[PDB]
Amino acid sequence: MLKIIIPTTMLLPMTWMSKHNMIWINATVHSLLISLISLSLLNQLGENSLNFSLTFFSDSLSAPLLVLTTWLLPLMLMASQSHLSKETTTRKKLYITMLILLQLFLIMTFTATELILFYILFEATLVPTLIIITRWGNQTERLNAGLYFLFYTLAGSLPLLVALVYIQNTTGSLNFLIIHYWSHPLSNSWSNIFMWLACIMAFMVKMPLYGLHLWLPKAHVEAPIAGSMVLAAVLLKLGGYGMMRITTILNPLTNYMAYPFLMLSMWGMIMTSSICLRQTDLKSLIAYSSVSHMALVIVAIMIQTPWSFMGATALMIAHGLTSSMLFCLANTNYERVHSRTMILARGLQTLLPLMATWWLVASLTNLALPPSINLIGELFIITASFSWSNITIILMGMNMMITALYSLYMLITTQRGKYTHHINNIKPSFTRENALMALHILPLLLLTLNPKMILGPLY
Amino acid sequence: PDSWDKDVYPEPPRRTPAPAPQTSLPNPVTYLTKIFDLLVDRPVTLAREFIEQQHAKNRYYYYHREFRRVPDITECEEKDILCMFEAEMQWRRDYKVDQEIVNIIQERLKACQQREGESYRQNCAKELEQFTQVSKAFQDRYSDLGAHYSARKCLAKQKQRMLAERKAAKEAAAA
Amino acid sequence: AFSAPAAYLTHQQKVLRLYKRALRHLESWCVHRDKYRYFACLMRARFDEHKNEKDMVKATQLLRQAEEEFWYGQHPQPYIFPESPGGTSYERYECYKVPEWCLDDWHPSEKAMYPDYFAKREQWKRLRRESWEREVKQLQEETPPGGPRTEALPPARKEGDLPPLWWHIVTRPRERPM
Amino acid sequence: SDAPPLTLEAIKDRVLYVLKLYDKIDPEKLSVNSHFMKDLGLDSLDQVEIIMAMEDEFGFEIPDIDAEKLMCPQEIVDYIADKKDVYE
Amino acid sequence: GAHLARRYLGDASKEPDPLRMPTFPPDYGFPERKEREMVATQQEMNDAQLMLQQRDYCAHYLIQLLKCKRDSFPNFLACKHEQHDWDYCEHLDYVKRMKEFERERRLLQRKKRREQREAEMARG
Amino acid sequence: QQERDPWYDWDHPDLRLNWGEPIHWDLDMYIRNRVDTSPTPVSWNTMCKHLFGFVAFMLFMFWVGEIYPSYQPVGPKQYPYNDLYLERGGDPTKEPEPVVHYEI
Amino acid sequence: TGFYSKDLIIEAVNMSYTNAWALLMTLIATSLTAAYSTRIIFFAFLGKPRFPPLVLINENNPLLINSIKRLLIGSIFAGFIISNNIPPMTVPNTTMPLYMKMTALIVTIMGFMLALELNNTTYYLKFKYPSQTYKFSNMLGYYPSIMHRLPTYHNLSMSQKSASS
Amino acid sequence: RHSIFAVTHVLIPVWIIHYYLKYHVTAKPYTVVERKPRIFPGDTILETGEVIPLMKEFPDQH
Amino acid sequence: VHIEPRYRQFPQLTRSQLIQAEFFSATMWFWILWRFWHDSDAVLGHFPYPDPSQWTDEELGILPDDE
Amino acid sequence: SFPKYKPSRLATLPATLDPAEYDISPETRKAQAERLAIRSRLKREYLLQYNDPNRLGVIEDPALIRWTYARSANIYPNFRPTPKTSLLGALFGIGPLFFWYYVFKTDRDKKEKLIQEGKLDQTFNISY
């Protein structure tokens, strides 16, 4: 695992020793090389995980997330360099350093064998994101957004720390292998109920769960493009990964402790899909769609079936890629017209046809068109829910209908109709933007040929 | 062909009738079949013959890996991590093998249904009962274990079923 | 579409508009030309019955009753011209209309083709740039201090003057731009 | 292909044709610049009927706000030419 | 249908019910009844793969028709006699079903008539 | 927005809005790609009665026709081999009850 | 082409243990089919011209003629050819009453005659206001007038006022 | 250049598919499954040379 | 085939379209007549419809109400 | 005379059927003139920037900014806890959650109790 971590660390002195006009080129090239190297972790053994050492291990769940992070870094660099052109060399190097530190913390988080190290890195991811949002955000609400993002996370995460140290004291270990092999049932008691809550609420708020999701629109809208990319693509999946790791020791309590969370997730996915229908800001719609998809992931994790975990893993990967692509698409238009209002710029298909094609493909993947992996995950989760209870199909179908509705609503509003007359500064699409959209979309379609790479350990 | 075992994947003797023309009109399907043969099946056969000639000059082998039988989870003490790990690996391997067995039986059922045509409801009863037996066994073995399954949970499910069956048998003995 | 609207419609304008709407809906009801002509002359006679009324109150009441009659007896599916706001071809060619400022973003290799067109476009741009200041000055001169009262614009009045605010009216893309 | 492009001469000839097929107008008396209210002694209803006849002739609707001011054949020709982008 | 009008508007107790019919024994009014026979065996119909609903008492003509369609494939107008035979046998089966309907109706009507008439004779 | 004048020279023709004018709180609901409030030839609460009555009448008539089906004056179709007992699922080791058909 | 399938469908619907209302509605729809076919032909091809004076009518293009010709040959012969070139998969209805055999044709002729009569009556120089049944039929039973306005308005209003705000 | 379309759009694609089906797809069990041909009385089997006996002497109500 | 507008006159017609339309209408009618000559049973019915009232009780097997 | 047309929310009253536009007073004409003057002044202000050759970019619209700010940022500062607000919030927030909890809990309790009886017909259910 050091063969991935050490080059990521080497990215720091390499970008701090580069010339003022070569930082983007060097960082992009070596980030792509690191992603290529990290692609070798997909070879999984089946029966058990790849245990490199006492500190790190790789699973069929961790490997797609690691590859997604390593692949997302170069796309973040490509998206960032346009709006940072006027910045000084030192501040651009600091921004790239923030991105590299975030990547390092993420790659170490997904491979830790022990839960305290996972917690330490999972909290350490906060600082670079907070710095990025509050320093390179564009509006004045970035400060309030950063405060929300920090405190919503910490209020859930601190009880997790207390629960983890208590569990290590009572059991003697927190190593995930020992945790799994020496699992014992949780009795029906108030102490066990509060232990369950302390082990669950941090990952709940990172998803986010409906009712604890208010930080996400603020943080995702007010962050720069790279910050939004990493928030939607990767940082939302930390909660799901933590849930999959932690629910091993929570049985059989989850059988009834999951009822309020399932109810909240289903009704709130309906609510957020409905909210997307009346939104004046283009980024907030994407944020709320992310909330709905993560609510579906929460249901999948809560029901505790192999098909549910497979669908949840597929949906996490697909949602990460699709949300990153949608955020980049919105950012291109924002850079054109310097406003996030959806109806300001209309009929962009007449002026930008290839970008309209990218918009159409992203909208089609957002509504989970077959045989894309988005629908693979969603269908697996829906089938698992149907096995859990036949009445879930009503809510699943309603959510599907509303998702198609607002996806095509966004597409029609932004791309169709007639152009706004007074707006006359819409230049032809750059090679960088088209390449960024292609690099987002092509892995999505290529993953359809080999769906088992992202289905997870339960495959 | 002979590539796959014909006992695992059996099929009926494939009875086919002989053509018995009743009219002097020429059959267009036969002429089209001859054209297709002469224009497609011969060049493809020649290309395959050349490919096999090239393959014969380079012959190498790959082997099926054999796994020893290690003690299962029933004969591991409570906190012996190594025996537990090896038993769990063996149990997972057996789970995969059982899944593949059910897959083979399902393939047999599907092939029977397609082959028998309009008489599938009568001529596929044996495949149906085979699938019923294997499905019941696989369900009893592995159903309701949920995610995070293990050999210990399978053993607990088996022991619960055994206790229920023993109680039922004992109460029937007094009847 | 081309004329600046007034603050309100007179009784005469409302009367003519009701006449035209009634005639069009009667034509929708009367498919054939001869029957439509017969009933249109009948409508014209009934309409001229109160042509020379001097009491404005009774004329207004007649107009209200006629409007109620039209609404009750209108055609639910009146004939609409294809390019009209309700027609089947209303906004069909809007996707083919590209604004003229997009031609400035063309690559020099694209402008290598069509050289005379772009030279004439340069001529037009010089004309607009040399007329804009005079247009603004004329608009400032001919405007009351309390802002304009209507959406009407004055014509050119000097020797080499162009009517103010003419660029986006003259440079419409087309009605069939492709 | 579709219909040939329209020309100013054709528009004027068709307008004069429609007006000469009107009974309340003398064919000899009628002229391109002949005012409807002043020279031909017509009223507003006759102007509305003329506008409707022009719409039927050219297969397109003229809004009432614009049709109110078409008081001579030349104005109708100019309106039709400018709407359909006819320049010669 | 007239039977529907008789059953739904008139006394439905005097009309046969298509779902539960016949209710009378098959040998009630007949002294001796001959059992209906088959020309085509179970194996022949299984090998011909007709359908579960085409395996009626008319199946042998269907087998003949299908065979003659198969042999005389290019001439699809040559299998007229076989089609006519199958249609005639189906028509005979339908006429037998109509006879069964009429027999049930008449038997039920006569039974009702005779039992109320014997009750009327016993009440006086 | 559908009720606004389509012949006016709007700043935004599709939107049917003018620059700088106050915008309705629910503009995105009334964009005319969506909910329309335009007057109808037939009064609201009159169309509702007709639609509801038509649907209720059709449903009630379908239920009545289900109670009173249409059929032909024929007996049930008769099948040779114990109503094809072996064909419709088989189980050939339980001796089905003899289904015997007689000619008429 | 339409005979070999539609008339068999009507025959099978008549001779089945089926809902009476469904059968009646199928027959009325069979009438209405000829009704609107007669409407199309009468209003589009017969009578005097009603289009603008500048005639652009020209159907002398090989693509249009060839394609319509191919589909015309299909619509004439495909029914017979396909019906005679497939195995029998449905048991034919061989014995049915004569009036019930001719039900489809009687229905079609009634539709033709009555639609043609009502279409011929519009030549008369007489004007009457539409009936309520005509308003129901023309406005599609008011289904798009209500179902496209009430549920959509309520859904969007609750999406903004309740869920979002 | 007369028959270029018919050799590149029909003959080449069917060469690849026929090779793909004949040697790869049909190299595994139950990949291409045909319903067995219908057998009628009087038919002759190609493999075993069997003759299916005729079908019980119709009453012949001609 | 070049055809020009005519402005309030019947449009110019070519011989080919007229002969093709007449030929295909005649083909349809000839096909209908040929089918009705050869397959009149498909429209008029072929097998007679029995009348249930024409059935005796001896062949239908019901007793004469006295047993 | 003829049957009357009554308006509603989703089918409003036509202008020609509005008695307001047929009962006119001089103050109404003055109001119409004031509205037309406001519209004309806004149109002139927009068209002076639209036709400017020098201007490049998006012409900012204050009205759109006001609409977006009111729909997004101005809502909470103008919120008061009110019996109407409190009741509507409680209903639309927790009513559906408890409704769905009741429905799902009842269904799953029925299914589990029916499983314990040994009567569910779970044959061939090997995937979950």
Ligand SMILES: CCCCCCCCCCCCCCCCCC(=O)OC[C@H](COP(=O)([O-])OCC(O)COP(=O)([O-])OC[C@@H](COC(=O)CCCCCCCCCCCCCCCCC)OC(=O)CCCCCCCCCCCCCCCCC)OC(=O)CCCCCCCCCCCCCCCCC
């Ligand atoms: C032995 C057995 C053989 C039986 C043979 C026949 C049996 C008797 C047949 C007689 C039945 C209908 C006869 C024709 C009807 C109309 C003729 C007529 O008088 O015209 C004047 C008039 C037409 O309006 P208009 O003002 O002249 O049109 C204005 C301009 O002319 C506008 O002009 P335009 O230029 O716009 O175009 C004019 C256009 C437009 O014309 C229209 O506006 C007519 C549209 C509606 C009438 C169409 C009749 C279809 C009725 C089907 C209803 C099914 C049940 C639905 C239940 C709804 C419940 C609310 O006309 C057409 O082009 C074609 C129209 C229809 C022609 C074909 C009709 C024949 C099919 C129906 C009979 C089936 C025959 C075979 C029987 C099969 C089974 C035995 O008709 C009426 O005023 C009343 C129509 C009667 C409809 C009643 C609907 C039945 C159910 C009522 C409700 C029952 C429940 C009680 C209430 C609920 C209590 C809780």
Ligand SMILES: CCCCCCCCCCCCCCCCCC(=O)OC[C@H](COP(=O)([O-])OCC(O)COP(=O)([O-])OC[C@@H](COC(=O)CCCCCCCCCCCCCCCCC)OC(=O)CCCCCCCCCCCCCCCCC)OC(=O)CCCCCCCCCCCCCCCCC
């Ligand atoms: C994750 C999804 C989303 C979840 C989160 C979103 C949803 C949850 C959070 C947001 C919604 C919950 C909000 C909670 C209420 C907050 C109230 C507040 O902030 O007031 C400050 C605010 C400022 O104080 P201030 O300026 O000093 O006062 C001047 C007032 O403005 C001057 O006002 P005034 O003088 O005109 O009127 C005041 C006066 C008069 O008030 C009125 O005129 C209106 C009547 C209010 C009280 C009774 C409600 C009447 C209508 C409904 C009655 C119940 C129907 C049945 C309910 C169950 C159905 C199965 O107050 C009363 O008479 C109330 C007496 C109490 C009698 C009934 C007590 C019932 C307790 C709850 C029963 C329902 C339990 C839930 C059942 C769920 C089953 C599944 O005071 C108010 O203006 C509101 C006063 C009325 C409050 C009524 C609250 C009803 C809503 C249910 C409360 C239970 C939920 C909370 C649980 C914890 C409770 C301990």
Ligand SMILES: CCCCCCCCCCCCCCCCC[C@@H](O)O[C@H](CO[C@H](O)CCCCCCCCCCCCCCC)COP(=O)(O)OCC[N+](C)(C)C
């Ligand atoms: C906006 C989104 C925020 C996140 C949402 C988080 C959801 C947290 C809710 C936790 C789920 C349930 C918690 C415990 C399960 C049962 C709770 C209790 O009501 O059940 C009964 C418990 O009985 C009583 O109800 C005791 C609880 C009463 C006191 C709790 C106050 C609840 C009021 C709601 C306050 C809101 C809490 C959330 C604040 C934000 C069961 O009866 P009993 O079998 O005998 O007890 C079982 C426990 N034993 C085995 C130890 C004995």
Ligand SMILES: CCCCCCCC/C=C/CCCCCCCC(=O)OC[C@H](COP(=O)(O)OCCN)OC(=O)CCCCCCC/C=C/CCCCCCCC
């Ligand atoms: C089972 C789950 C689903 C059941 C249905 C629940 C209700 C669905 C509510 C959907 C709300 C979506 C609103 C957002 C859409 C945006 C606004 C919009 O679409 O505008 C309406 C738009 C424009 O209207 P037009 O008349 O066509 O305009 C043309 C001239 N201008 O038209 C629409 O698309 C509206 C569609 C609304 C559909 C709602 C009615 C559906 C009811 C179905 C019930 C019947 C079930 C079928 C039974 C089958 C038998 C087993």
Ligand SMILES: CCCCCCCC/C=C\CCCCCCCC(=O)O[C@H](COC(=O)CCCCCCC/C=C/CCCCCCCC)COP(=O)(O)OCCN
């Ligand atoms: C940003 C929003 C996120 C909010 C999430 C907050 C919820 C976190 C879950 C509860 C936090 C406290 C958990 C305590 C750590 C668990 C360790 C444990 O299990 O020890 C228990 C101790 O249990 C407790 O003490 C729990 C009491 C609660 C203390 C603080 C209460 C604060 C409010 C609690 C309810 C809210 C939690 C869920 C709300 C989610 C957010 C709304 C038993 O130990 P023993 O004493 O040894 O008992 C056995 C031997 N006799």
Ligand SMILES: CCCCCCCCCCCC(=O)SCCNC(=O)CCNC(=O)[C@H](O)C(C)(C)COP(=O)(O)O
């Ligand atoms: C098909 C369904 C449609 C049917 C709907 C019903 C139709 C309406 C029926 C009857 C309508 C009336 O009587 S409406 C009553 C008409 N009476 C008046 O208008 C009195 C004052 N007249 C004037 O002001 C001008 O002379 C003026 C007339 C405007 C001409 O102006 P010009 O000369 O300067 O063009």
